[PDB]
Structure 1
């Protein structure tokens, strides 16, 4: 249900800024760069406990107020005002797919929006 993607990404990991996902080489617009399996938290367990951990930096809203943590690279993308990556949530398959929003140049950081949303590509 989820194979290797094989995209020209690296993680950069600095004392200063922590971790981020960066382009090794130019990437075409609308290229799927990552498919991340999700670790799912129930609504109750995230409200009672999960939200008071560092999970609160990274998780995404899911259906019925459940909360998902993207494994793979998905939690590593930083947020920016001008993101170059967008994503789609798949409810049936419990993953999140990441796509380039435009052509990406070599050495650019791959960033997502600050904002979340709740709809699913399989709905």
Structure 2
């Protein structure tokens, strides 16, 4: 259901800027670089408790007021105003897939939008 995606990625973890995902070699546009299984929180447990933790910084809104944390590499992409990675949520199989918006050059950070949204590729 979710096998290894052998993308040329590494994680940089610096005292300065924390963690981020960076390209080891060039990557073509529209390449699936990550499929993250999601840890799902019910609306009530997130509203009552989850939102008061560091979860708040990483989760993705989900259907019916649920809230998902992306496992795999998904929580490691930083947010940027000019993102080069976009995502798709899968409600049936509980994952999020990441893709490149354009050609990525080596040493570029992979970054997603600050924005969230609620539609699913499977709907």
Q: TM-score under structure 1 normalisation?
A: 1.00
- Which portions of structure 1, spanning 4 or more consecutive aligned residues, are displaced by more than 3 angstroms? none
> Once the 2 structures are TM-superposed, how far is the Cα of residue 96 of structure 1 from its aligned partner?
0.0
User: Distance in 2 between the 1:90 and 1:26 partners?
Assistant: 27
**Number of matched pairs:** 123
Cα deviation digits, residues 58-117 of structure 1 (max 9, x gap): 000000000000000000000000000000000000000000000000000000000000
Q: Name the CA distance, whole Å, in 1 between partners of 2:54 and 2:15.
A: 18
Q: Distance in 2 between matches of 1:2 and 1:26?
A: 24
- SS for the counterpart of 2:87 is strand
Q: What secondary structure sits across from 2:47 in the alignment?
A: helix
- TM superposition shift of 1:9: 0.3
1:122 paired residue number: 122
Unaligned runs of 5+ in 2: none
Over the aligned positions, Cα root-mean-square deviation in angstroms equals 0.3
State the distance in 1 between where 2:79 and 2:43 align. Answer: 24
Structure-1 separation of matches of 2:35 and 2:25:
19
The 3-state SS of whatever aligns with 2:86 is: strand
Shift of 1:16: 1.0
Shift in Å, 1:27: 0.2
Distance in 2, Cα, partners of 1:80 & 1:5: 23
Unaligned runs of 5+ in 1: none
